[PDB]
Paper text:
The Thoeris defense system triggers abortive infection (Abi) upon phage detection. The ThsB genes encode Toll/interleukin-1 receptor (TIR) domain–containing proteins responsible for phage detection, while the ThsA gene encodes an Abi-triggering effector protein. Collectively, our biochemical and structural data demonstrate that the nucleotide signaling requirements for ThsASIR2-SLOG and ThsATM-macro effectors are distinct and suggest that ThsATM-macro effectors can trigger Abi via membrane perturbation by a mechanism that involves nucleotide-induced oligomerization of its macro domain.
The Thoeris defense system in E. coli CFT073 consists of a TM-macro ThsA effector (EcThsA) and two TIR domain–containing ThsB proteins (EcThsB1 and EcThsB2). We expressed and purified the macro domain of EcThsA (EcThsAMacro; residues 62 to 278). To define the structural basis for ADPR binding to EcThsAMacro, we crystallized and determined structures of this protein in ligand-free state and in complex with ADPR via soaking, at 2.7- and 2.1-Å resolution, respectively. The C2 and C3 hydroxyls of the proximal adenine-linked ribose form hydrogen bonding interactions with S217 and K262. The pyrophosphate and distal ribose moieties are accommodated between two ADPR-binding loops located between the β3 strand and the α2 helix and the β8 strand and the α6 helix. A quadruple EcThsAMacro mutant with the binding cleft residues D83, S217, T220, and K262 (DSTK) mutated to alanines is not capable of binding ADPR. The ADPR/IAD binding sites are located at the dimer-dimer interfaces, but neither ADPR nor IAD is directly involved in subunit interactions.
Author numbering:
A (entry chain B): 64 to 271
B (entry chain A): 64 to 278
């Protein structure tokens, strides 16, 4: 019946707290799909998803300006993938999972893959690959800085073969993938995992 | 001092014990590389790996027989990768990680990648992807059957950016990923993880019980 716990992981504090991601001070992480889509129409991007809420309610400036900024940005060659020329709707450039686009205090990250068949989806290995690559990026780049994340993949993402996986189990995977990442960093990022305040019932923080 | 432990993981008992993989009853898993190389000459495969030690002392029949058997075997379309024609020494057909070739009571699996200098290596994402794919296969194909494994990657394999990762850390990751796999299988394989008897010094079986809950 508690709402926050601080965890000593590899000699660094990881906070898990009930609350609202959008209210956190510092960097806040928003999961986009692999095309960094921005069309919120409840089929590509759901109005209910954090991706949709951020664009609809919190993105400063227009969605058009954001597309241009992302379009004209230059990512490492490790992060640009094949262009899906034959797509019905949405952007065409694909990005490697974990790629980050910075937008003010928001870290927009290529999280889920998309296709008309499985819509937003990831294999369990893709999910683990995302976490490792993502944690490695934030720990090298945002060392000693605050980074707040939700429970990645607990929304409408179908993790293939894991339709029913629980929020707590995804939280556990997030935690031990973070442990692995920060093994190689003296000063990692200052991570906070936010559980939507109306969902601390779904999770017993003493289990952790 | 403690040499064996039984853990309930997702409602199934997993055994971690000191011993000898080759003395294990039931299926034994041998880590081959992504080409299923069989040439044990300390250039491709080394004599001191379980890969080379299985070929040298435990393989039934000649290495030629095994090569031909693997080449003729019908692998899944997704298990078959592209063919590296530039390779100057060894087999050329790449296989996706976790691919399994069953050989009597041995499960030969494509574990490590070989770079241009025949160095065994994996990235941490590759390693995790191998474990999930491999656990998924054996829990599907060998449900309720004994499957014994060593601590994958604790040999010469370099896990990129984790050169000094401890055997105990690899063990927990193996347990974490196996737990995830059997969230999908109500009747998983009966897993035994074998720590080489002379390496039990490096592993404290008490620091491992939390992994059975995914922590
Ligand atoms: N204000 C909040 N604060 C904290 N957590 C919240 C909040 N609102 C919701 N959550 C919870 O935060 C968790 C994550 O919410 P999401 O990001 O939607 O789900 P995903 O990680 O599967 O991303 C969906 C993907 O597919 C899409 O196309 C996107 O492009 C993504 O790529 C859920 O448990 C929410 O209840
Ligand atoms: N009899 C034994 N019983 C149990 N464990 C053993 C035994 N002998 C050694 N071990 C331990 O078992 C662990 C694993 O030993 P290995 O399989 O060699 O190492 P890897 O997993 O990094 O695979 C080597 C890769 O590179 C190669 O080219 C292959 O192709 C592979 O792809 C070590 O801790 C050993 O001490």
């Amino acid at each position: 019946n508690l709402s926050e716990i601080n965890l000593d992981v590899e000699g660094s504090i990881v906070t898990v707290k009930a609350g609202d991601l959008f209210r956190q001070d510092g960097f806040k992480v928003i999961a986009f799909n692999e095309y960094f889509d921005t069309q919120v129409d409840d089929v590509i991007i759901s109005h209910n998803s954090l991706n949709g809420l951020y664009i609809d309610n919190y993105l400063a400036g227009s969605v058009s300006d954001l597309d241009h900024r992302i379009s004209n940005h230059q990512f490492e060659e490790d992060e640009l993938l094949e262009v899906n020329h034959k797509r019905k709707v949405g952007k065409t450039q694909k990005y490697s999972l974990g790629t980050i686009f910075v937008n003010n205090d928001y870290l927009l990250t290529a999280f889920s893959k998309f296709d008309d068949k499985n819509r937003a989806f990831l294999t369990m290995p893709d999910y683990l690959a995302f976490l490792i690559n993502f944690w490695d990026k934030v720990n090298r780049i945002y060392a000693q800085k605050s980074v707040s994340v939700p429970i990645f993949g607990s929304g409408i993402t179908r993790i293939k073969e894991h339709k029913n996986i629980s929020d707590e189990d995804l939280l556990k995977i997030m935690l031990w993938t973070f442990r692995i990442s920060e093994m190689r960093f003296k000063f990692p990022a200052k991570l906070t995992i936010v559980i939507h305040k109306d969902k601390i019932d779904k999770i017993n923080l003493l289990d952790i």
